[PDB]
């Protein structure tokens, strides 16, 4: 159920945490490309991207983005003036699509000012869903340039899923959705003198997993405290779930069709 | 619309005294993008700290990972200090073993 996404970020007065422009791409959870207002170059962020992709690709998209850098600066400057905004403000953009296991494809295009939804593109009606009066005046200017709306529609509808398919055939990790979890259960002392059972799963891929604790077969969601799925750095993930031990408990885990139950001594 | 980050300190591999590892500090779901993150060892700041590719979720709220190679000693006390626009005083999150 793989996906390809590219974002753009623009910031007004960044006193440290600059630069004013950043653009990063991802195939699923993997960074693939990078660009920023400092290093005015598109670069690979994966090894299978360095190989496979001809230097023509990088050169063409470096020129393109250098221009998208200038547009972003203009588009943002304009926004703060239609509001009565002064200081530092954030402008974000996102494209990309998904390839659902059935064969059906999706695709989105969104914009945000100060982390709030500003403009949403509906590719099936070549329309923009404007949040306020400012967005509506920008939306109006965009809707008159029809060939752009068609370029965008077609990029999602065709070019995007084609590119994702190419990136996935440079996958021996991306396409590979089998790296099984390594589950272990260890008693902790959460509070003195309270003991808690901890189920810890690590080293799995892809990051979609499910784990729970069960008292005598009954699952008790209100007594369970779940942990988030976290990145490890080595390309695999970790997660946990805990239960408060009172004065028969078992741990359950599902991952890429594999089902496992662990029982405490 | 500003969001306070969610700080989480943990190790790449399960903890073992004397063996090498990595201390991760996963900062997520905050707005705006300016975040100062430092890894600590017995109060002192760790000089060599590498960090991940900044990304933003669909809620436009950014997330980063900061990590450092380390050999967990028996007595060593590790933590993560974080300051944002939403924080008046930096939050320090101790590593749990
Ligand atoms: Cl464009």
CA distance A242 to chain B (A): 15
CA-angle at B88, arms to B87 and B90, nearest 5°: 65
Query: What total of structural domains would you count in chain A?
Result: 2
Q: Report CB contact under 8 Å: A90, B31.
A: yes
Q: Which of A88, A92, A231 sits opposite B65 (nearest CB)?
A: A231
CA distance B43 to chain A (A): 24
The DSSP bridge pattern shows strands B21-30 and A43-44 to be unpaired
Domain boundary (A176, A198, A224) is at A176
Under DSSP, is residue B83 helix (H, G, I), strand (E, B) or coil?
A: strand
A196 and A123 share a domain? no
CA nearest neighbour of A25 among A2, A50, A47, A43: A43
Structural domain containing residue B85: 1-97
CA distance B39 to chain A (A): 16
Return the H-helix or E-strand segment holding B54.
Answer: none
User: Any idea what the CATH number is for the domain that residue A94 is in?
Assistant: 3.30.500.10
A22 and A9 share a domain? yes
- Long-range CB contact pairs, B54-58, < 8 A, 24+: B54/A22, B54/A24, B55/A7, B55/A24, B55/A26, B55/A31, B56/A7, B56/A9, B56/A92, B56/A94, B57/B28, B57/B29, B58/A94
CB atoms within 10 A of CB A238: 25
A210 and A112 share a domain? no
Burial, A69: exposed, middle or buried (Cβ in 10 Å; 0-12, 13-18, 19+)? buried
Distance (Å) from CA B42 to ligand 1 centroid: 49
Rounded distance between C-alpha atoms, residue A22 and residue A90, angstroms: 12
Structure method: X-ray
Three-state secondary structure readout of chain A: CCEEEEEEEEECCCCCCCCCEEEEEEECCEEEEEEECCCCCCEECCHHHHCCCCHHHHHHHHHHHHHHHHHHHHHHHHHHHHCCCCCCCEEEEEEEEEECCCCCECCEEEEEECCEEEEEEECCCCEEEECCHHHHHHHHHHHHCHHHHHHHHHHHHHHHHHHHHHHHCCCCCCCCCCECCEEEEEEEEEECCEEEEEEEEEEEECCCCEEEEEECCEECCCCEEECCCEECCCCCEEEEEEEECCCCEEEEEEECCEEEEEECC
Rounded distance between C-alpha atoms, residue A122 and residue A113, angstroms: 19
The number of residues in chain A equals 265
Q: Answer yes or no: are the C-beta atoms of A41 and A55 closer than 8 Å.
A: no
Q: Which residues of B touch A229 (CB under 8 A)?
A: none
Q: Which two tokens stand for residue A102?
A: 């059935």
Rounded distance between C-alpha atoms, residue A237 and residue A254, angstroms: 14
CA nearest neighbour of A255 among A184, A187, A203, A186: A203
A253: which residues sit within 8 A by CB, 6+ positions away? A181, A183, A199, A201, A209, A210, A211, A259, A260, A261, A262
A92 and A212 share a domain? no
Q: Which of residues 20-79 of B touch A (CB under 8 A)?
A: 22, 24, 26, 31-36, 52-56, 58-61, 65, 67
Which residue in A115, A182, A187, A190 has the most chain B C-beta atoms within 10 A of its own C-beta, making it the best mutation to test that interface? A115
Rounded distance between C-alpha atoms, residue A135 and residue A151, angstroms: 21
A169 and A65 share a domain? yes
Q: Answer yes or no: are the C-beta atoms of B11 and B34 closer than 8 Å.
A: no
Q: Is the peptide bond before A193 cis (omega within 30 degrees of 0)?
A: yes
Q: Which residues of B touch A9 (CB under 8 A)?
A: 33, 56
Q: How many Cα atoms within 13 Å fall on the side-chain side of residue B61?
A: 11
Return the H-helix or E-strand segment holding B5.
Answer: none
Query: What total of structural domains would you count in chain B?
Result: 1
Q: Which two tokens stand for residue B61?
A: 């709220």
Structural domain containing residue A220: 177-264
Q: Report CB contact under 8 Å: B34, A16.
A: yes
User: Any idea what the CATH number is for the domain that residue B54 is in?
Assistant: 2.60.40.10
Q: How many Cα atoms within 13 Å fall on the side-chain side of residue A75?
A: 25
Which residue in A16, A106, A228, A233 has the most chain B C-beta atoms within 10 A of its own C-beta, making it the best mutation to test that interface? A233
Q: Answer yes or no: are the C-beta atoms of A264 and A216 closer than 8 Å.
A: no
Distance (Å) from CA A262 to ligand 1 centroid: 51
Rounded distance between C-alpha atoms, residue B3 and residue A239, angstroms: 24
Q: Answer yes or no: are the C-beta atoms of A237 and B26 closer than 8 Å.
A: no
Q: Which two tokens stand for residue A105?
A: 């494809």
């Amino acid at each position: 159920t793989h996906s390809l996404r590219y974002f753009r970020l623009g910031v007004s007065d960044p006193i440290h945490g600059v630069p004013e422009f950043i653009s990063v791409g991802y195939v699923d959870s993997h960074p693939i490309t990078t660009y920023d207002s400092v290093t005015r170059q598109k670069e690979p962020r994966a090894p299978w991207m360095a190989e496979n992709l001809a230097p023509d690709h990088w050169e063409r998209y470096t020129q393109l983005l250098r221009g998208w850098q200038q547009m972003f600066k203009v588009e943002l400057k304009r926004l703060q003036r239609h509001y009565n905004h002064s200081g530092s403000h954030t402008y974000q953009r996102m494209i990309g699509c998904e390839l659902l296991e059935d064969g059906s494809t999706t695709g989105f295009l969104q914009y945000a000012y100060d982390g709030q939804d500003f403009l949403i593109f509906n590719k099936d009606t070549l329309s923009w869903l404007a949040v306020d009066n400012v967005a509506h005046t920008i939306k109006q200017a965009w809707e008159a340039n029809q060939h752009e709306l068609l370029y965008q529609k077609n990029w999602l509808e065709e070019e995007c899923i084609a590119w994702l398919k190419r990136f996935l055939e440079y996958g021996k990790d991306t396409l590979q959705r089998t790296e099984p979890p390594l589950v272990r259960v260890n008693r902790k002392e959460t509070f003195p003198g309270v003991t808690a059972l901890f189920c810890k799963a690590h080293g799995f891929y892809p990051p979609e997993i499910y784990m729970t604790w069960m008292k005598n077969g009954e699952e008790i969601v209100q007594e369970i405290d779940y942990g988030d799925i976290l990145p490890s750095g080595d390309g695999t993930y970790q997660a946990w779930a805990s239960i408060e031990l009172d004065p028969l408990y078992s741990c359950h885990v599902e991952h890429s069709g594999v089902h496992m139950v662990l029982q405490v001594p | 619309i500003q969001r306070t980050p969610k700080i989480q300190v943990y190790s790449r591999h399960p903890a073992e005294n004397g063996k090498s590892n990595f201390l991760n500090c996963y900062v997520s779901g905050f707005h705006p993008s300016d975040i100062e993150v430092d890894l600590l060892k017995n109060g002192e700041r760790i000089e060599k700290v590498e960090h991940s590719d900044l990304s933003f979720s669909k809620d436009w709220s950014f997330y980063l990972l900061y990590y450092t190679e380390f050999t967990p000693t028996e007595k060593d006390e590790y933590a993560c200090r974080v300051n944002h626009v939403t924080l008046s005083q930096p939050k320090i999150v101790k590593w749990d073993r």
